[PDB]
Design a protein around this ligand. Sequence first.
Ligand SMILES: CC(C)CN(C[C@@H](O)[C@H](Cc1ccccc1)NC(=O)O[C@H]1CO[C@H]2OCC[C@H]21)S(=O)(=O)c1ccc(N)cc1
Length: 323
Amino acid sequence: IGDEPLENYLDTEYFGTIGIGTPAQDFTVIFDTGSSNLWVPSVYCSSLACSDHNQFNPDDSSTFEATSQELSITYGTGSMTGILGYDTVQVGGISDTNQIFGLSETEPGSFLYYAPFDGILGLAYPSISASGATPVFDNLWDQGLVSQDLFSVYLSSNDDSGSVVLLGGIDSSYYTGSLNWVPVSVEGYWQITLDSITMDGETIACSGGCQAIVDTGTSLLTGPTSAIANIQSDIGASENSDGEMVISCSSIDSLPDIVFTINGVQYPLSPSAYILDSCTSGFEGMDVPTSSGELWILGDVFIRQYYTVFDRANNKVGLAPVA
Ligand SMILES: CC(C)CN(C[C@@H](O)[C@H](Cc1ccccc1)NC(=O)O[C@H]1CO[C@H]2OCC[C@H]21)S(=O)(=O)c1ccc(N)cc1
């Protein structure tokens, strides 16, 4: 069982340190349950974001093995191109030998330039991995480096230490109540079916059910723009001169919970959770069309309240209230 500590950056990004190569070269990476590739910047990249982050040098690693395979990835915000290579990745105390990963050759745009992390370590299914690159957790399981084919995530609140990805384990000191299990509706993301979203007993969005993904790599709780607009109006959030969804901090003590029903079980978010003396909404409209329908994203606003188990043996997500 391996523990990967995560730094809680402003309650907005959660990244941990990994080592790549022999001797290890260290990188910070977002542990991203919304994607499946591992990549870091490399000495082959001249983009600005490469210049202001740690760059992998395969020349200095005695265990590196080159490939002729290229890689390209476009995220919601940010993108990269590069080349795949193999090396040993130290992650959570585990020596992940023979791990394929991306060495960036371009990283355009300001988001990656201003972000504190060097790269991204995806934790989702192989079906959405660019170039069919084996995801880290698949390679761990393939090599028997974890005995149980699952991992769990605790994300801390209030910029506190203690966030972790627990590779191969579930730890009940991080939660209370019973874990409830949700089948993965479509294997790619950690995608699940939401039944309803309610406030003070009435349905405010997702009437008749909708699709959602559980994504540590997204800060906010996002949904289709039209639905989110209603929710913003429902909680009293107004966009201001600067493009921020502003809300009176006094509503934190006024407003009722917003309740997500998932597989028939109610998961409340208190206004303490879905309102971030500058208070803004934890919701954001973002349209993610798929053959499944538009996706909602249960990002860190949600995951901070629910210890989450990602079970690849079973293709299920487990949820329980954080301790
Ligand atoms: C780069 C990540 C650390 C951040 N992203 C979260 C990530 O989970 C998204 C979450 C996501 C998912 C779907 C649509 C938009 C965003 N996944 C994603 O874009 O996956 C990509 C992998 O290759 C492609 O195939 C799947 C989608 C692409 S992100 O949505 O782009 C993002 C970027 C900036 C901020 N501030 C907040 C979120």
